[PDB]
């Protein structure tokens, strides 16, 4: 890749929409792994009960 | 002397008799598994 392209900054943070389609997160990590540390509030609420 | 007692043997009867599900699902089969597991066996069944 040319040096002019590798240096181009195109990332603009967002707050109301995810950085990528929410479906992509299922591909980056395994939703059901026993190594999952980031759980949802609805899950922890069901685990504490 | 020894006899050809395995002539005409099928591999479906091998899974029904000495299979993994024939052992985890029975009280006496869970002992065989744990024994072979405690000894180090790789082939717990079949």
């Amino acid at each position: 890749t040319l040096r002019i392209d590798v240096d181009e900054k195109t990332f603009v943070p967002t707050l109301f929409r995810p950085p990528a389609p929410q479906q992509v997160l299922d591909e980056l990590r395994n939703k059901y792994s026993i190594f999952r540390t980031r759980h949802t509030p609805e899950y922890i609420a069901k685990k504490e009960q | 002397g020894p006899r050809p007692t395995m002539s005409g043997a099928t591999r479906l009867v091998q899974k029904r008799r000495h299979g993994f599900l024939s052992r985890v699902k029975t009280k006496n089969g869970q002992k065989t598994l744990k024994r072979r597991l405690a000894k180090g066996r790789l082939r717990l069944s079949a």
Partner: protein, 180 residues
């Protein structure tokens, strides 16, 4: 944006699969394309993977699994296992595709075929001898290919016998300080 088939709803944005495009068989028509796909790949995936990624329409797909020989964990030692089988798929292209013919052996110099060939024959001859030993046999001395060292001792033999050269005692057998 209208695919010839019906597309699924589960969207895959970052597929991790590797698709290999293999050469067809000699007698196969030019509308069949053979690929090596993951074992979990199915006919619907290849049809959708070939159109959205490479823009290739297919009127049908065929798939067959190739098993792998059972082996030992460490070649000649270890427990008996079986590698993961291989899946091949043959797609019926809507547009014919013809492969190029392999280059002639004399025109493969870009790949260093000369050196590669010498190395291939060496391993071919070591695998053959190790099979002759697996039958409980050895190559008789009369059948061993004469090497370069045995061809130079026959040219000297004919030069000493003929009388061209005169034999003389060796001078490099050992570096003694006495020199007698």
């Amino acid at each position: 944006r209208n695919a010839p088939f019906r597309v699924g709803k589960k969207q895959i944005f970052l597929p991790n699969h590797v698709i290999t495009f293999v050469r067809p068989l000699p007698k196969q028509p030019p509308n069949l394309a053979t690929f090596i796909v993951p074992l979990e790949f199915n006919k619907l995936d290849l049809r959708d993977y070939l159109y959205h990624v490479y823009n290739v329409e297919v009127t049908g797909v065929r798939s067959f699994v190739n098993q792998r020989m059972h082996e030992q964990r460490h070649g000649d030692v270890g427990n008996w296992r079986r590698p993961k089988s291989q899946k091949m798929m043959i797609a019926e292209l809507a547009k014919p595709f013809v492969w190029p013919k392999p280059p002639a052996e004399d025109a493969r110099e870009a790949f260093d075929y000369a050196m590669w060939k010498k190395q291939k024959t060496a391993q071919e001859q070591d695998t053959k001898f190790q099979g002759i030993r697996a039958q409980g046999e050895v190559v008789p001395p009369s059948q061993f290919e004469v090497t370069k060292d045995r061809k130079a001792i026959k040219a000297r033999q004919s030069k000493f016998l003929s009388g061209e050269e005169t034999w003389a005692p060796g001078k490099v057998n050992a570096f003694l300080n006495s020199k007698i």
